[PDB]
Amino acid sequence: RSRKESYSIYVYKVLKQVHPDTGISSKAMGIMNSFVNDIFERIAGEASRLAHYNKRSTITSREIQTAVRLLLPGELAKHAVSEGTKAVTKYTSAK
Template identity: 55%
Template sequence: MAELGEDIDMMDKFADDDKGKFKPSKKEKPMDKLLKDKDNDKKRKPKKKPARFLTWQSYIHKVLKTVHDDSCTLSSKAMQILDSFANDLFERISTEAVKLLRLNNKKTLTSMEIQTAARLVLPGELCKHAIQDGAKAVQKYNNSAGGE
């Protein structure tokens, strides 16, 4: 029993001693050295870029001005509705074009797939005008320096 009492006294000694505790090393890590600047001891953090949202508002405004000059304006709510409409159409046509690519086992999206997707998504007369304007835009692009 005497030995047990001595063991308890020894444990009390080690409990007060700092040698038994874990101490992290004070050495700098190599990455910390790279991040530190000689003039400035603070670590550099990369700035977060704000999320960018695709909006068609400027294009809608330009089309409105070419069609109706200055006599017609849109409220912000109406502009948001037209913007979401344009995003929805773009998403539908692109989704349909990707489905066509997968069906035909192709990897390259061409104007032919976009035309076919537009025929599937858009109704009647709207489809005809969209395909005509799209073909005109592709022809204009090919005639310019970008199509070479």
């Protein structure tokens, strides 16, 4: 039996965080998995173009930041950059 992938449990937990009293359909969970897929793919493609228009092959978080604020529209993007940056601080401040 080949082991297949999903992101269902993760975003499921996130949904339980932001709304404890809320159910969901299974197809919509698949939709959100496809959503994460699509956003990830556009970001990664912008990362590869970041590489080739920078002639470098290392990926750091700075490239991810500039990729996100290339793709996403402004206000949403800046809030997301804030969330990611504070997470970078909280992780890399410890181990």
